[PDB]
């Protein structure tokens, strides 16, 4: 819901390629994240309106 | 069916050699692929007619 159907993506899992859509991240939602303790921390956020 | 009987092949599994036929890929069809979740993604396809 929070992502556009034609979402553009640059990430190390794409190996320097540009990925379009949500099909690519689905593999990580299905396999890995479906789960040991994990803590995230956001540092120095900047927002441009 | 989709491959010619005298199919030519260059691939890293051939270690820089040119492989003819389908006997070479049979080892990978029999052993490895006969099976955990795997997702393929095709990027930037170009077709020459």
UniProtKB/Swiss-Prot annotation, chains A, B:
Post-translational modification: Palmitoylated. Probably palmitoylated by ZDHHC3 and ZDHHC7.
Modified residues (Phosphoserine): 34
Compartments where found: Synapse; Postsynaptic density; Cell projection, Dendritic spine; Cell projection, Dendrite
Known role: Calcium/calmodulin-dependent protein kinase that functions autonomously after Ca(2+)/calmodulin-binding and autophosphorylation, and is involved in various processes, such as synaptic plasticity, neurotransmitter release and long-term potentiation. Member of the NMDAR signaling complex in excitatory synapses, it regulates NMDAR-dependent potentiation of the AMPAR and therefore excitatory synaptic transmission. Regulates dendritic spine development. Also regulates the migration of developing neurons. Phosphorylates the transcription factor FOXO3 to activate its transcriptional activity.
Family assignment from sequence similarity: Belongs to the protein kinase superfamily. CAMK Ser/Thr protein kinase family. CaMK subfamily.
Subunit structure: There are 4 genes encoding calcium/calmodulin-dependent protein kinase type II chains: CAMK2A, CAMK2B, CAMK2G and CAMK2D. The corresponding proteins assemble into homo- or heteromultimeric holoenzymes composed of 12 subunits with two hexameric rings stacked one on top of the other. Interacts with BAALC. Interacts with MPDZ. Interacts with SYN1. Interacts with CAMK2N2. Interacts with SYNGAP1. Interacts with SYNPO2. Interacts with SHANK3. Interacts with GRIN2B. Interacts with CACNB2. Interacts with LRRC7. Interacts with GRM5.
Protein's name in the database: Calcium/calmodulin-dependent protein kinase type II subunit alpha
Organism: Rattus norvegicus (Rat)
Upper taxonomic lineage: Eukaryota, Metazoa, Chordata, Craniata, Vertebrata
Gene: Camk2a
Residues of the full protein shown: 371 to 421 of 478
């Amino acid at each position: 819901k929070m992502c556009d159907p034609g979402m553009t993506a640059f990430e190390p899992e794409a190996l320097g390629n540009l990925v379009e859509g949500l099909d690519f991240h689905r593999f990580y939602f299905e396999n890995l994240w479906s789960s040991k303790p994990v803590h995230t921390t956001i540092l120095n956020p900047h927002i441009h309106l």
